[PDB]
Model the fold of this input.
Amino acid sequence: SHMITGIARRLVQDGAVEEAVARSAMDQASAAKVPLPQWFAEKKLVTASQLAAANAVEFGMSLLDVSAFDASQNAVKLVSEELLQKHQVLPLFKRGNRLFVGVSNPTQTRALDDIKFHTNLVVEPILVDEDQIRRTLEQWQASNAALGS
Amino acid sequence: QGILSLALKDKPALYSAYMPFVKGGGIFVPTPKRYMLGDEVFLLLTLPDSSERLPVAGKVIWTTPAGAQGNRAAGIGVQFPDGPEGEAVRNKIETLLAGLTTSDKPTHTM
Done:
Protein backbone atom coordinates (compact mmCIF):
# COMPACT_ATOMS: atom_id res chain seq x y z
CA SER A 1 0.00 0.00 0.00
CA HIS A 2 2.21 2.72 1.43
CA MET A 3 3.84 1.49 4.64
CA ILE A 4 6.46 3.86 6.04
CA THR A 5 9.71 1.92 5.65
CA GLY A 6 13.31 1.58 6.68
CA ILE A 7 14.93 4.35 8.61
CA ALA A 8 11.73 6.41 8.51
CA ARG A 9 9.79 3.64 10.25
CA ARG A 10 12.45 3.38 12.94
CA LEU A 11 12.61 7.13 13.49
CA VAL A 12 8.83 7.00 13.97
CA GLN A 13 9.19 4.06 16.40
CA ASP A 14 11.87 5.96 18.29
CA GLY A 15 9.64 9.02 18.46
CA ALA A 16 12.34 11.03 16.67
CA VAL A 17 10.23 12.14 13.70
CA GLU A 18 6.68 11.90 13.20
CA GLU A 19 4.38 9.99 10.87
CA ALA A 20 3.51 12.67 8.32
CA VAL A 21 7.12 13.94 8.23
CA ALA A 22 8.46 10.39 7.87
CA ARG A 23 5.98 9.52 5.12
CA SER A 24 6.93 12.73 3.29
CA ALA A 25 10.65 12.00 3.65
CA MET A 26 10.19 8.51 2.24
CA ASP A 27 8.18 9.73 -0.75
CA GLN A 28 10.34 12.79 -1.47
CA ALA A 29 13.54 10.76 -1.26
CA SER A 30 12.03 8.36 -3.78
CA ALA A 31 10.96 11.22 -6.09
CA ALA A 32 14.49 12.63 -5.94
CA LYS A 33 16.12 9.17 -6.26
CA VAL A 34 18.16 9.80 -3.11
CA PRO A 35 18.73 6.96 -0.59
CA LEU A 36 16.60 7.47 2.49
CA PRO A 37 19.45 7.68 5.07
CA GLN A 38 21.25 10.27 2.94
CA TRP A 39 17.93 12.11 2.52
CA PHE A 40 17.45 12.30 6.29
CA ALA A 41 21.05 13.41 6.80
CA GLU A 42 20.71 16.18 4.19
CA LYS A 43 17.21 17.37 5.19
CA LYS A 44 18.07 17.40 8.92
CA LEU A 45 14.60 16.11 9.82
CA VAL A 46 16.07 14.66 13.05
CA THR A 47 19.23 15.04 15.08
CA ALA A 48 22.40 13.25 14.00
CA SER A 49 22.20 11.06 17.11
CA GLN A 50 18.55 10.14 16.42
CA LEU A 51 19.54 9.24 12.87
CA ALA A 52 22.49 7.14 14.05
CA ALA A 53 20.23 5.22 16.46
CA ALA A 54 17.76 4.52 13.65
CA ASN A 55 20.58 3.54 11.24
CA ALA A 56 21.99 1.14 13.84
CA VAL A 57 18.80 -0.83 14.31
CA GLU A 58 17.81 -0.71 10.62
CA PHE A 59 21.19 -1.85 9.25
CA GLY A 60 22.16 -4.06 12.21
CA MET A 61 25.25 -2.09 13.20
CA SER A 62 26.74 -1.34 16.58
CA LEU A 63 26.68 2.24 17.83
CA LEU A 64 29.18 3.98 20.13
CA ASP A 65 29.10 7.22 22.15
CA VAL A 66 32.67 8.35 21.41
CA SER A 67 32.38 11.13 24.00
CA ALA A 68 32.81 8.25 26.48
CA PHE A 69 35.82 6.85 24.62
CA ASP A 70 39.21 7.25 26.31
CA ALA A 71 41.04 9.56 23.91
CA SER A 72 44.47 8.22 24.85
CA GLN A 73 43.48 4.88 23.26
CA ASN A 74 42.43 6.35 19.89
CA ALA A 75 43.77 4.78 16.72
CA VAL A 76 43.68 7.96 14.62
CA LYS A 77 47.35 7.88 13.58
CA LEU A 78 46.91 4.57 11.78
CA VAL A 79 44.95 6.33 8.99
CA SER A 80 46.30 9.05 6.71
CA GLU A 81 44.78 12.50 7.08
CA GLU A 82 44.03 12.19 3.36
CA LEU A 83 41.74 9.18 3.95
CA LEU A 84 40.17 10.92 6.96
CA GLN A 85 39.19 13.95 4.89
CA LYS A 86 38.05 11.91 1.89
CA HIS A 87 35.72 9.69 3.90
CA GLN A 88 34.70 11.48 7.15
CA VAL A 89 35.34 8.44 9.34
CA LEU A 90 36.86 8.32 12.83
CA PRO A 91 39.35 5.48 13.47
CA LEU A 92 38.46 4.27 16.94
CA PHE A 93 40.51 1.48 18.32
CA LYS A 94 42.91 -1.32 17.45
CA ARG A 95 42.84 -4.74 19.09
CA GLY A 96 45.05 -7.50 17.75
CA ASN A 97 44.83 -7.26 13.98
CA ARG A 98 41.48 -5.37 13.99
CA LEU A 99 40.88 -1.64 13.50
CA PHE A 100 37.43 -0.38 14.45
CA VAL A 101 36.37 2.63 12.40
CA GLY A 102 33.52 4.98 13.27
CA VAL A 103 31.16 5.81 10.41
CA SER A 104 28.00 7.89 10.27
CA ASN A 105 26.84 6.34 6.98
CA PRO A 106 25.79 2.67 7.30
CA THR A 107 26.40 1.85 3.62
CA GLN A 108 29.82 3.41 2.93
CA THR A 109 32.11 0.54 2.00
CA ARG A 110 34.81 1.99 -0.27
CA ALA A 111 36.05 3.95 2.75
CA LEU A 112 36.49 0.68 4.63
CA ASP A 113 38.27 -0.83 1.62
CA ASP A 114 40.62 2.16 1.32
CA ILE A 115 41.43 1.96 5.05
CA LYS A 116 42.01 -1.80 4.86
CA PHE A 117 44.42 -1.52 1.95
CA HIS A 118 46.13 1.43 3.69
CA THR A 119 46.54 -0.19 7.14
CA ASN A 120 46.49 -3.90 6.21
CA LEU A 121 44.38 -4.38 9.30
CA VAL A 122 40.97 -6.00 9.52
CA VAL A 123 38.53 -3.11 9.35
CA GLU A 124 35.27 -3.25 11.33
CA PRO A 125 32.68 -0.43 11.05
CA ILE A 126 30.97 1.05 14.12
CA LEU A 127 28.31 3.70 13.83
CA VAL A 128 29.16 7.09 15.31
CA ASP A 129 26.82 9.96 14.69
CA GLU A 130 28.03 12.57 12.23
CA ASP A 131 28.39 15.42 14.76
CA GLN A 132 30.43 13.24 17.10
CA ILE A 133 32.72 12.24 14.24
CA ARG A 134 33.62 15.75 13.16
CA ARG A 135 34.12 17.12 16.72
CA THR A 136 35.84 14.10 18.23
CA LEU A 137 38.27 13.73 15.35
CA GLU A 138 39.78 17.17 15.94
CA GLN A 139 39.82 16.64 19.72
CA TRP A 140 41.71 13.36 19.31
CA GLN A 141 44.05 14.97 16.79
CA ALA A 142 44.91 17.64 19.39
CA SER A 143 45.55 14.89 21.95
CA ASN A 144 47.78 12.98 19.53
CA ALA A 145 49.56 16.21 18.55
CA ALA A 146 50.60 16.73 22.17
CA LEU A 147 52.73 13.56 21.79
CA GLY A 148 55.04 15.53 19.46
CA SER A 149 55.41 16.48 15.81
CA GLN B 1 13.44 -0.01 32.47
CA GLY B 2 14.15 -2.38 35.33
CA ILE B 3 17.31 -3.91 36.72
CA LEU B 4 19.59 -5.49 34.17
CA SER B 5 21.62 -8.44 35.40
CA LEU B 6 24.92 -9.88 34.15
CA ALA B 7 26.69 -12.94 35.58
CA LEU B 8 30.20 -13.81 34.38
CA LYS B 9 31.41 -17.35 35.17
CA ASP B 10 35.04 -17.13 34.20
CA LYS B 11 37.81 -14.85 33.04
CA PRO B 12 37.17 -15.41 29.28
CA ALA B 13 33.56 -14.29 29.81
CA LEU B 14 34.77 -11.21 31.69
CA TYR B 15 37.30 -10.50 28.93
CA SER B 16 34.55 -10.57 26.29
CA ALA B 17 32.40 -8.20 28.39
CA TYR B 18 34.96 -5.64 29.58
CA MET B 19 35.31 -2.35 27.68
CA PRO B 20 38.79 -1.05 28.61
CA PHE B 21 38.55 1.88 26.12
CA VAL B 22 35.65 3.47 28.01
CA LYS B 23 36.46 6.37 30.34
CA GLY B 24 36.19 4.90 33.82
CA GLY B 25 35.70 1.41 32.40
CA GLY B 26 32.59 -0.10 30.87
CA ILE B 27 30.95 -3.50 30.57
CA PHE B 28 28.91 -5.13 27.79
CA VAL B 29 25.50 -6.42 29.00
CA PRO B 30 23.61 -8.71 26.59
CA THR B 31 19.93 -7.86 26.45
CA PRO B 32 17.19 -7.70 23.80
CA LYS B 33 15.72 -4.55 25.34
CA ARG B 34 16.37 -1.52 23.17
CA TYR B 35 18.20 1.40 24.81
CA MET B 36 19.37 4.81 23.63
CA LEU B 37 22.91 6.08 24.12
CA GLY B 38 23.03 8.15 27.29
CA ASP B 39 20.23 6.25 29.01
CA GLU B 40 20.97 5.74 32.68
CA VAL B 41 20.72 2.09 33.59
CA PHE B 42 21.06 0.05 36.77
CA LEU B 43 23.06 -3.19 36.55
CA LEU B 44 23.57 -6.07 38.96
CA LEU B 45 26.98 -7.53 38.02
CA THR B 46 28.41 -10.87 39.16
CA LEU B 47 32.12 -11.35 38.50
CA PRO B 48 33.82 -14.77 38.40
CA ASP B 49 35.63 -14.46 41.76
CA SER B 50 32.48 -14.60 43.98
CA SER B 51 28.69 -14.69 44.11
CA GLU B 52 28.45 -11.08 45.35
CA ARG B 53 26.26 -8.94 43.09
CA LEU B 54 27.86 -5.56 42.43
CA PRO B 55 25.49 -2.63 41.86
CA VAL B 56 26.45 -0.44 38.93
CA ALA B 57 24.55 2.77 38.28
CA GLY B 58 25.85 3.32 34.77
CA LYS B 59 25.28 5.05 31.44
CA VAL B 60 24.58 3.45 28.05
CA ILE B 61 27.57 4.25 25.80
CA TRP B 62 27.23 1.42 23.28
CA THR B 63 24.44 -0.60 21.70
CA THR B 64 24.40 -3.63 19.43
CA PRO B 65 20.95 -4.37 17.95
CA ALA B 66 19.10 -7.61 17.38
CA GLY B 67 19.98 -9.25 14.09
CA ALA B 68 23.35 -7.53 13.93
CA GLN B 69 25.57 -8.31 10.94
CA GLY B 70 27.91 -11.21 11.69
CA ASN B 71 27.66 -13.02 15.03
CA ARG B 72 27.43 -10.05 17.40
CA ALA B 73 25.27 -10.38 20.51
CA ALA B 74 22.60 -7.74 21.05
CA GLY B 75 23.10 -5.61 24.12
CA ILE B 76 24.38 -2.41 25.68
CA GLY B 77 27.75 -1.14 26.79
CA VAL B 78 27.40 0.40 30.24
CA GLN B 79 29.89 3.03 31.43
CA PHE B 80 30.88 2.79 35.11
CA PRO B 81 30.36 5.92 37.22
CA ASP B 82 33.49 7.94 38.05
CA GLY B 83 33.21 7.78 41.88
CA PRO B 84 34.62 5.13 44.25
CA GLU B 85 31.88 2.51 43.64
CA GLY B 86 32.52 2.54 39.88
CA GLU B 87 36.29 2.74 40.35
CA ALA B 88 36.09 -0.30 42.63
CA VAL B 89 34.25 -2.29 39.97
CA ARG B 90 36.73 -1.32 37.27
CA ASN B 91 39.63 -2.12 39.63
CA LYS B 92 38.31 -5.61 40.38
CA ILE B 93 37.82 -6.30 36.69
CA GLU B 94 41.24 -5.30 35.56
CA THR B 95 42.94 -7.36 38.29
CA LEU B 96 40.74 -10.36 37.41
CA LEU B 97 41.92 -9.83 33.82
CA ALA B 98 45.62 -9.88 34.81
CA GLY B 99 47.42 -11.62 31.95
CA LEU B 100 44.37 -11.28 29.67
CA THR B 101 45.12 -7.57 29.16
CA THR B 102 47.31 -7.81 26.04
CA SER B 103 45.16 -10.44 24.34
CA ASP B 104 44.26 -10.09 20.67
CA LYS B 105 41.03 -12.04 21.06
CA PRO B 106 37.81 -10.35 19.88
CA THR B 107 35.27 -9.15 22.45
CA HIS B 108 31.57 -8.36 22.48
CA THR B 109 32.47 -4.76 21.62
CA MET B 110 36.03 -3.75 20.64
Q: What stands out?
A: The longest helix of chain B spans residues 84-96. The two ends of chain B are 26 Å apart (CA to CA).
